[PDB]
Design a protein around this ligand. Sequence first.
Ligand SMILES: Nc1ncnc2c1ncn2[C@@H]1O[C@H](CSCC[C@H](N)C(=O)O)[C@@H](O)[C@H]1O
Length: 218
Amino acid sequence: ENNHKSLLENLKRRGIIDDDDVYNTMLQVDRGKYIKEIPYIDTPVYISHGVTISAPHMHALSLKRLINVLKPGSRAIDVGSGSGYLTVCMAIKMNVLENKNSYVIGLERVKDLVNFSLENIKRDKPELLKIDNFKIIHKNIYQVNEEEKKELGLFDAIHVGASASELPEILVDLLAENGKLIIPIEEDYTQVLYEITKKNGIIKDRLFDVCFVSLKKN
Ligand SMILES: Nc1ncnc2c1ncn2[C@@H]1O[C@H](CSCC[C@H](N)C(=O)O)[C@@H](O)[C@H]1O
């Protein structure tokens, strides 16, 4: 009897979702269109290539932290887009379909996962792969040179869905004034979810311990 909406209601009861905009966004994006196996259980679910689609509570929590910077008219990047679940959540919240100034990009290092996410989006919201301001790119974030770096511009919201040995400086440079970056960083014996903000040129905010797949440098 498991369904997407009842999943979201379970997260609310558990206080994982405490925001109407987090709820309404996720409600618009059915998890079962993004993973086939046990799509509504609150746990990560294996895809391929050593990677999982994150637990719904991890999507919910990250989306919560970014909720106010995911604004129509703004620019967001999902680093490690994976299943594309969270990337579509960003497209929805920012209304890339109606708002031409909204921009959402997913970067994914693994090509099979690029193709996996693009297939998910075709079946869910095929309108997203007809537009100029939504894309899923096959790319490692650590292989972004000066040229593409300049070309990407600045982002009001940066989500990184994989844990980094340390805070990659590119992500700091990709960040717009007042933008938020959500990222797990290995800090001694844990992965620590950080919220990083820019208020002239960075305030680091240690959130709590998390478990993410690794942000691979090659
Ligand atoms: N250096 C890197 N650059 C871009 N993507 C990376 C990366 N290192 C790991 N990844 C990707 O990061 C993803 C993290 S797991 C997937 C998380 C995703 N938001 C989801 O819920 O589906 C994996 O798909 C992995 O392939």
